[model samples]
Target: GRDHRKIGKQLDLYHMQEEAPGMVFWHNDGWTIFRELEVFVRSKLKEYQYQEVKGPFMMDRVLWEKTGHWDNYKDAMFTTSSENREYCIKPMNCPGHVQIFNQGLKSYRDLPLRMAEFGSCHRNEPSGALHGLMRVRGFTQDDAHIFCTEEQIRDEVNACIRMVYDMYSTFGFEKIVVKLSTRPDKRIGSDEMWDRAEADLAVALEENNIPFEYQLGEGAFYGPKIEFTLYDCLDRAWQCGTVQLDFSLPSRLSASYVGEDNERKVPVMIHRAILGSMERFIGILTEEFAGFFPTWLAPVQVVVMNITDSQSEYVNELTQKLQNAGIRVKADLRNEKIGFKIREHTLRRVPYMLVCGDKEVEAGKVAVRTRRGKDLGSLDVNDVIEKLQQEIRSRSLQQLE
Candidate 1:
């Protein structure tokens, strides 16, 4: 089996150590990939008119008690007793989001407020339950909460489904397994609330022409959810995206707005996460392509190499110029043979390589090669940057050729 644990180490991407078990220690290349992912998702959030926010990583345990998560999640959470007040390291971003939502008194004019965060969370799981990045105690999510009227649920859920597929496809996943999980036998919301919530989720998918299976009694006690699972190259299912209709959290945390009828009302809360856990998604991504990410997602997109000492200056200049143009590139001037440098970077799965020799450097040109060993002929420096930038702007899944 191709495993992310071994692949990550072989590629110098990330590692999990005993001191901080289940928490990833990302290296240079790995953090590049991580940052690129964050940039992509952030752009998407901005496009959707979301108010990006950061929530406290640790809050008083009483807040969790009021939200009902502490009752069922107390043991699994990491709690500290400081200054006579017990504070819990958050296990999820929902409760903190509620706190932000309750900060300002609002009216019907502010009916649909979409708030988002790339918030980190920590949970205390037994050692036996740990599995590389796939199952971890410390992780972050592309989490968001939508405070909207009940009637606004369908439209919001519909947009979420659209975003999940669009982003998933951009990452090279084509096979998606969609599921609509129904109410648990023992849940917090009333039967009427559950009925409307369930219907709203189902109708969104149906109108979007998304076929989904029903997962009976599989939802969390507070809400029904639509889960989107991506199949990796090995056909392993990783449930990543989710949109849940929550009628419980707002009421429990006292989130309210003035209604059109001039009455105070608890706003309906919708919890959504495109990538449920950033760590798990990266784990899946590592194994999905076996460290050969696409051009835009590649940690080091290009490497500039010199054939001999005579070409070192050109190599350095080319590398610096590309970097100045906002390309992720590395310079290789170790006096290694041009062929050897090419092979090394190929092994690293870098998408593009620029080889500078006496002839190419004199002519103000660099020979290009793809990870697949395809020679794109000699290209001028500006032309090379233009091509690479265009490929990245398109987020091409294809290996540059």
Candidate 2:
């Protein structure tokens, strides 16, 4: 398996110190990738009609107990007490979401209400279990919950399946393995409830023509789930997304909605995540592309260089123009050999290099070279900008040809 730690260091992407074990101190380059991914996910949320929300990182102990996390996952939770009241850092977002749903009387018309959060959560993971970005004590989850009726379960789950595949396809993860995890032996719901939940989820998948394998007794203590695993370029699989059909949480938390008959009924909560953890997803993306991300995801997409002192002004102008156009560009105006600058930027995995000299500067064009070692010959500055802008706007996986 490829290690993100070593690659992260070499690329100056992130670092971890003993002072903050299992937590990453993201460098500018690493943060850039993270922000880009966050923006992309936010766009999808808007499209899906999901309203983003934030919750307290630390909550009262009573909340955790009501959600059953205290009894079952107490060992993994970080707790603190103040003024004789015990509090715990949240390990998941469902309980908080349920509380939000409890606020203000909800009606049957509000069914299928989608609440999302990039929730900051913590766990008391043992030292031995910590691994780079893959395993950590602190992380943010792209977590969300849908409160709907029993009749809406199939449609909600189907929409989740489609959304997961759509997101995976964006990252070039076309090969996906979906698994249906049935109720565990120690789960909260009754056998009949589990049966109905599992059957509904299975029907959703079958109706959508999505194939999946069954993992008996592998579900969370509260419900069954569909786990989505993606295969990377090296053929390694990572489980990064999930859709869980929960029938117990709302009832346990006393969350309910007014039905069409004007009677109170517990709403079914469907928990889902496209990227389970933002940190882990970026780590997977790093290794999947071997640090050569597509231009849209690259921190420094282009670096403009000067062959000699004569091209410094032109190089600066080119860099400024690109930057103003929202391109991530850097200027290498140091007095160095043209080949030396190109070699350095190329090794840095910059997607494009714009070289300026007497000929290029006089012709009002820049010589272009790709990280793949393709010499695109000299091109007008406007043409280069348009080409790069188009690639970025399209978020194309292919490099300049």
Per-residue CA lDDT of model 1 for 1-401, tens digit only, reads: 36889888888989988999888898988888888889889988998878899998899988889987777878898988988899998889988888888887888788689899998989899878898989999988999998999888899998888888989988888899999999898898688988988999999999988889999999999899999999987888888999988878899888899999999998888889998888888888888888888888898889999888998888889999999988889998896787899998999989998998888998999999988889998888898899899989988887555
Residue-level lDDT tens digits of model 2 in 197-281: 9999999999888899999889988789999999998999999989998878899899999999999899999999998899999
Clashing pairs in 2: none
Best by TM-score: 1
Weakest lDDT window of 10 consecutive positions for candidate 1: 392-401
Return the lDDT, model 1, position 392: 94
Runs in model 2 with CA error above 4 Å? none
TM-score of each: 0.97, 0.96
